[model samples]
Target: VPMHPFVKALQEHFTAHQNPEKAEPMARYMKNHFLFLGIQTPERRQLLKDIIQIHTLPDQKDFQIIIRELWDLPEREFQAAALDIMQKYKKHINETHIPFLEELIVTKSWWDSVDSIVPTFLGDIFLKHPELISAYIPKWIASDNIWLQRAAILFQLKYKQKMDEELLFWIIGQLHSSKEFFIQKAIGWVLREYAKTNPDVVWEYVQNNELAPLSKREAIKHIKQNYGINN
Candidate 1:
């Protein structure tokens, strides 16, 4: 396939701003799973903004093609750039994008990308297309992919008052016993976020559930601090 127009502009824009000096440490921070252009967040976002202003954004049909081109690139910044574009067009995201999102989730699997894809990408789809949840979320939690499980736990991080208590608690119950550090952290994280809205429910759930020490500690950090309810 010829180079995607949006990706063509992305390469042009991102290449001009490459920071070789910053690339090594940035890759190391990702545990060396991917490369970086040495471009940082603010600069990358601004560059993307400039590109969008200068060029037509990809149509929904081109979303997969454009993202796949970005994913195929060796640099991590390409994936970040893909996410920025996706976020801008999040209203266009829907059930059709689940397979693509899962591909991204499992392919470049990591805390940084998966975490962002969950709330930023998956959150919108799952919320708007609630029917897709029962089809996908359970499959993810049951899969061997820890990143998928983490995504399953986290897709609701920003739901707050719109949070699904039954689904969140059910996901927690399924993964709370996991030995993976990411899984443990995700459990604690979703609970901690939910606690911001309903401390009582979070407090009670953690009290009764057998969670990893790290998970338990993270889940109730705020409750202990704010409610003076140390256990």
Candidate 2:
């Protein structure tokens, strides 16, 4: 498709506001801006729907150009765009795009974008195409890129009704030794999210595993108020 025009428009739009130093600092904006965007849950859902309406299959070259052009958006916007594109082309997702997605996760540094993509976009894709993803998720867990490994753990965040608890536990177990703050937090966050549906399962996993304090604390924060602790 002739996405060059659309891509160019995006480039020009962002170029006018570009801060060379901050162009690549997308993650910073996500962290700082999230506090003020109080109704993010619905806002994000709408944004995804909007992007899906406008999405088209640009050629690989055009895709790369688009990525480079919009690489300056705040982390949330960047991730929002990625999720939009993935949802638009969800039926077409294949191994080819995995590398492209991986590049995005690893390139501009992790924090917001990587975590967002995994749980929502990447995880959704993998759930649909398990045969292709099963082979790679483990490799990603062992990757030199911390973001990719983190993605593996975080991808299962929204898989509540369809969650593969065994795989979720395995991914957590694989990375239990890592000291990275985000990784630990993601492990905790996933467990906490799962607790919404299966509190006992999450609690059991936490009790059986030697989780980092932050992970343990974050995972169980809501249990006291909502589920009521046994003790």
Q: By lDDT, who's the top model here?
A: 1
Residues 1-231, candidate 1, lDDT per residue (tens digit)?
A: 799877988898899999999999999999999988999999999999898888878677787788888888889999888888777777777788899899999987789889888886789888888887999988998899999999999999999999999999999889978999999999999999999999999988888879999999999888877667645
Reference-based TM-score, model 1: 0.93
Lowest-sum lDDT 10-residue window in model 1: 222-231
Stretches of candidate 1 exceeding 4 Å from the true structure: 229-231
User: In order, what lDDT does every prediction score?
Assistant: 0.88, 0.68
What lDDT is obtained when candidate 2 is compared to the true structure? Answer: 0.68
| Candidate 2, residue 198: how far the Cα is off, in Å | 0.9
For residues 1-231, what per-residue lDDT tens digits would candidate 2 score against the true structure?
344565445434433443445434432455554312222435445544544356545655454556654454443444445455555555666656777777778866657667656776677777777777677888998888788888888777888888888888988999988899888988888888999989989887887788999998899988746656676
lDDT of 1: 0.88
- Give the Å error, residue 46, model 2: 13
TM-scores, in order shown? Answer: 0.93, 0.72
